[PDB]
Amino acid sequence: RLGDIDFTGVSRTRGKFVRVTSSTDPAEIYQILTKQWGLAPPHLVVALMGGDEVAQLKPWLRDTLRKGLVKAAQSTGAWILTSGLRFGITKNLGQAVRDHSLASTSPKVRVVAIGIAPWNMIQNRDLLLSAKPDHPATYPTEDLPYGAVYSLDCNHSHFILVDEDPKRPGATGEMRVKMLKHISLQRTGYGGTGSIEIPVLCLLVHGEPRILQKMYKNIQNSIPWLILAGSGGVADILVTLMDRGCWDADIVQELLINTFPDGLHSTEITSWTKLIQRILDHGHLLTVHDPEQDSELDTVILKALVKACKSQSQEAQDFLDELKLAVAWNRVDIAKSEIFSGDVQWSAQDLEEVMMEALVNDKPDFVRLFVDNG
Amino acid sequence: RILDHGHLLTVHDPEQDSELDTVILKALVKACKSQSQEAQDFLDELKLAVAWNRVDIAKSEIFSGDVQWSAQDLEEVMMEALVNDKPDFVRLFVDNG
Amino acid sequence: TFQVVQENADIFWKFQRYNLIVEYHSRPALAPPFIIISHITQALLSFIKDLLERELPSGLDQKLMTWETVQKENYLAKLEHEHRESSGERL
Ligand SMILES: [Ca+2]
Ligand SMILES: [Ca+2]
Numbered sequence A: 001r002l003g004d005i006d007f008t009g010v011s012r013t014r015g016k017f018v019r020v021t022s023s024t025d026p027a028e029i030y031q032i033l034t035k036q037w038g039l040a041p042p043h044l045v046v047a048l049m050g051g052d053e054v055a056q057l058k059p060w061l062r063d064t065l066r067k068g069l070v071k072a073a074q075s076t077g078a079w080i081l082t083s084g085l086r087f088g089i090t091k092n093l094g095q096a097v098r099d100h101s102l103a104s105t106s107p108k109v110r111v112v113a114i115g116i117a118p119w120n121m122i123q124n125r126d127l128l129l130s131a132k133p134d135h136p137a138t139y140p141t142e143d144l145p146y147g148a149v150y151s152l153d154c155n156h157s158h159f160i161l162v163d164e165d166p167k168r169p170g171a172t173g174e175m176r177v178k179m180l181k182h183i184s185l186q187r188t189g190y191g192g193t194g195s196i197e198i199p200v201l202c203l204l205v206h207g208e209p210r211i212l213q214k215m216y217k218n219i220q221n222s223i224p225w226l227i228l229a230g231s232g233g234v235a236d237i238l239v240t241l242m243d244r245g246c247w248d249a250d251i252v253q254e255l256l257i258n259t260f261p262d263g264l265h266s267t268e269i270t271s272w273t274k275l276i277q278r279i280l281d282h283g284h285l286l287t288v289h290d291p292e293q294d295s296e297l298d299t300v301i302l303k304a305l306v307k308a309c310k311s312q313s314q315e316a317q318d319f320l321d322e323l324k325l326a327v328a329w330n331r332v333d334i335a336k337s338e339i340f341s342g343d344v345q346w347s348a349q350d351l352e353e354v355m356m357e358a359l360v361n362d363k364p365d366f367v368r369l370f371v372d373n374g
Numbered sequence B: 001r002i003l004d005h006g007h008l009l010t011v012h013d014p015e016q017d018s019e020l021d022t023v024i025l026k027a028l029v030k031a032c033k034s035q036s037q038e039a040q041d042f043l044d045e046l047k048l049a050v051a052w053n054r055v056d057i058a059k060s061e062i063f064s065g066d067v068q069w070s071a072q073d074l075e076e077v078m079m080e081a082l083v084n085d086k087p088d089f090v091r092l093f094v095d096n097g
Numbered sequence C: 001t002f003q004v005v006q007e008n009a010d011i012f013w014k015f016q017r018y019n020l021i022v023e024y025h026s027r028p029a030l031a032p033p034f035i036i037i038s039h040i041t042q043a044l045l046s047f048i049k050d051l052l053e054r055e056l057p058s059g060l061d062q063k064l065m066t067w068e069t070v071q072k073e074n075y076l077a078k079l080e081h082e083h084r085e086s087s088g089e090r091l
Helices: A027-038 A059-074 A090-104 A169-183 A211-219 A232-245 A250-259 A266-282 A298-314 A316-330 A332-339 A349-362 A364-372 B021-035 B040-052 B055-062 B072-083 B087-095 C003-009 C008-023 C037-050 C058-086
Strands: A002-008 A011-019 A046-051 A078-082 A109-116 A135-138 A158-162 A187-190 A194-197 A199-204 A225-228 A286-289
Touching: A002 A250, A011 A027, A011 A250, A011 C003, A027 A169, A046 A059, A046 A169, A046 A211, A059 A078, A059 A090, A059 A109, A059 B087, A078 A090, A078 A169, A090 A109, A090 C058, A109 A169, A135 A298, A135 B055, A158 A169, A169 A199, A169 A211, A194 A316, A199 A211, A199 A232, A211 A225, A211 A232, A211 A266, A225 A232, A225 A298, A225 C037, A232 A250, A232 A266, A232 A286, A250 A266, A286 A298, A298 A316, A298 A332, A316 A349, A332 A364, A332 C003, B021 B040, B021 B055, B040 B055, B040 B072, B072 B087, C003 C008
Parallel strands: A002 A135, A011 A158, A046 A078, A046 A199, A078 A109, A109 A158, A199 A225, A225 A286
Antiparallel strands: A002 A011, A187 A194
8 A cells, every 4th residue: 555646736746655544553654654664763753633623823823833843843853743634734834844845955854744644535535546656646736625625735745544444433533643652652772772762742723622532542641732822722721721720610611612612512512521621630741832922832842741751750761852852952951950850860871872962963051961960 | 880881991090101092092992802802893993003003902902812803804904004104013914814 | 535445345355356257257268369269259159050147947946945935034033033132122
């Protein structure tokens, strides 16, 4: 099912894909992604959740989000997981990744826009069904309204098309959660005689009550979440509930009804209320990105990942990928405040590889910090 | 009863405020917000904000998440900001759709 | 007069150097009198049959435009960050 796509339209773009079923092992898909396609194990995985609703982001918010995400991902090798359909924030994120790729003079580090899209939502899927190894399938690019069927985004380099599951019609979310968990459990080799985890973060923009189950599934898999403050939907519910500080059934139901008039069902609203209640009950895995206040996405991402790691374990070996991200983003203050506090014990041998990384990449503040810390 | 309404009342202290256009715009925006959420009702307040160069008030109140603004709703005020040389409002209208 | 020109001597000389290099880049390779040979050769080539100002393929042109747009965005972002951390803005 491995095929290449020749995108016809504005620019001649090439894209690979793999059809998968709801019962496929995420290990096989990761193996295909790494070896069969040459994508190096990423140093940061950002999964885009939401943004497929008819209510789109404001141009300033959309531009700030896409630019910040791409610039944060440009320091190291990062995978951006979206629903690779040409619509919503996915199209604009693909455009930003494309623009960075064209403007990048360093192909060593790459930002990869990997799409995970339903097979029942691809326009002219039979056109790409051919996928001859010698002759890549020709795929036309069509911009369509909100509707129910889109075309694959030409600016997404790689795709993971998942067939509908006959048992339950929710294969896409389950596949996304399984892939995120498998990536989060991966341990790529670091420097010499070392291995590091892959930081995985979920970015939520204008969620609908339907992805609450998948959001809670990802939370249960200890995957941190990032929420856009003014995103539009469930994101405002979550940020307002955190701003209040307390969440009860009455306030949860009131906000849910206020922001979603169409949802009116006792059992469904009770399920959503309980889901949200548990989501906030976790808390340490959730963070708020307000572009008015924060306006620096790398800082918020690093804080979220460090908070998740701190709530997870105290070993220094688990902080190595967060430390690498801090070094790459020049966030010496965050590293000093959180990573190198008294909670975590750091050894000299634990810091050798990051010392080399700070030395080669000209990060004198981190060199001084590592000297200060052993 | 007058105080019980409240949202329709504002205080202008020349010692503190000293800028009557700002207070007037805030009062009118507060009244409109308590009245309705449609963007068509905010058009005159937006015109006053453009004429008074009160970009911060417009961003904080008129163009918040409470009111939904469409591209066709902003065409006339876009022309007004363009002709009257209000680059901050031109940027705001581009930012808002 | 000397003081006014000497303050901007670098800019004036670099403009002069641009003009001279452009002038001698478009000149025939032969020096007069010999330039008659170059003139005859050019006339014969015209009858029988660039480093600067070159036309680019559409893909490369679009890539260059996007690259310049990204550079401009980075430059403006650095300007905004510099403005935010200024003493007056902090005050
Ligand atoms: Ca970690
Ligand atoms: Ca009005």
